[PDB]
Amino acid sequence: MNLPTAQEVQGLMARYIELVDVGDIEAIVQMYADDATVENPFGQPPIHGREQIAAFFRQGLGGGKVRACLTGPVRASHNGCGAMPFRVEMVWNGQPCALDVIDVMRFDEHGRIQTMQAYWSEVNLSV
Amino acid sequence: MNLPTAQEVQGLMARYIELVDVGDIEAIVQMYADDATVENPFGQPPIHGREQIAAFFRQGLGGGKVRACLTGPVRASHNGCGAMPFRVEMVWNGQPCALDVIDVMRFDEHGRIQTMQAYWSEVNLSVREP
Ligand SMILES: C[C@]12CC[C@@H]3c4ccc(O)cc4CC[C@H]3[C@@H]1CCC2=O
Ligand SMILES: C[C@]12CC[C@@H]3c4ccc(O)cc4CC[C@H]3[C@@H]1CCC2=O
Ligand SMILES: [Cl-]
Ligand SMILES: [Cl-]
Ligand SMILES: [Mg+2]
Ligand SMILES: [Mg+2]
Ligand SMILES: [Mg+2]
Ligand SMILES: [Mg+2]
Ligand SMILES: [Mg+2]
Ligand SMILES: [Mg+2]
């Protein structure tokens, strides 16, 4: 069996959303493997490795005006993978909005995200 | 239809839990590709094809009482895919249970589910009342 137990996958993925809810970049980017991949959104060309993932997050979060929170428990397999539902709250045209997302993560043998997919699209907006 | 737009996804996946909830096995199994592949749970080998899928739904839904609902919105993409959060209420050896689940699905070029991964485990079970 290190590779997170279904249990631990729960605590980790939950820590990711808090980092994200605070905007700590640097901390987000360390939760990933050095060579990870992000598909955000799913359906698009991946990215790859921490340098590009720090940049993605710098462009997405860095300008503030983002909160996120789980909207139900993390789900977690026996192999290293979990899925979670969350909602991001931001600001469009100077007014609130939102975005409902599901991330799906696969942790390595060191408990670092290796992959991930972020399910969403424009239907998942609102006000 | 053909490959389903993000909007069409949302409707197929929400129907699918309506069918699960009502327990119309036969109409569910038909929401799949005739050779679809179910990983339920994700981590355990798959199954495959409409006869083993059926068999799985009969085993899981055939006694009535299982209630399923969506606990938030279907998330949907642009490449024929979606993911959704829900909860399954079921009584297990005298007990009242619930299992929080997320299903990830891909559809086909024909509005049929080609693959389903279900994410879950005992950390998602609660012995509680619906
Ligand atoms: C960048 C983003 C906020 C941060 C979201 C985010 C953050 C972390 C994550 O694992 C997934 C996602 C999915 C959508 C992202 C939003 C798209 C538009 C926006 O303002
Ligand atoms: C089979 C099952 C009921 C039906 C659930 C179900 C139904 C549809 C679906 O797309 C995913 C799942 C995941 C869990 C399934 C339960 C595990 C124990 C049980 O009795
Ligand atoms: Cl939930
Ligand atoms: Cl949700
Ligand atoms: Mg916070
Ligand atoms: Mg490595
Ligand atoms: Mg908050
Ligand atoms: Mg119903
Ligand atoms: Mg086919
Ligand atoms: Mg109901």
From Swiss-Prot, chain B:
Annotated GO MF terms:
steroid Delta-isomerase activity
Catalytic residue positions = 16, 40
Q: Which residues bind substrate?
A: 103
The alphabetical list of record keywords is: Isomerase, Lipid metabolism, Steroid metabolism
Q: What is the effect of changing residue 125 to A?
A: Slightly reduces activity and reduces protein stability
Q: Name one GO biological process term.
A: steroid metabolic process
Q: What is the effect of changing residue 127 to A?
A: Slightly reduces activity and reduces protein stability
Q: Does the keyword Zinc apply?
A: no
Reply yes or no: does the keyword Isomerase apply. yes
EC supergroup of this enzyme: isomerase
**What catalytic activity does the UniProt entry give for this protein?**
a 3-oxo-Delta(5)-steroid = a 3-oxo-Delta(4)-steroid
Query: Which Gene3D superfamilies would you find in this protein's record?
Result: 3.10.450.50
Q: Please state, per the UniProt record, what induces or represses the expression of this protein.
A: By steroids.
- What SUPFAM superfamilies is this protein classified in? NTF2-like
Mutating residue 16 to F has which effect?
Answer: Reduces activity 2000-fold. Reduces activity 10000-fold
Protein's UniProt name: Steroid Delta-isomerase
- Please tell me the species this chain comes from: Pseudomonas putida
UniProt lineage: Bacteria, Pseudomonadati, Pseudomonadota, Gammaproteobacteria, Pseudomonadales
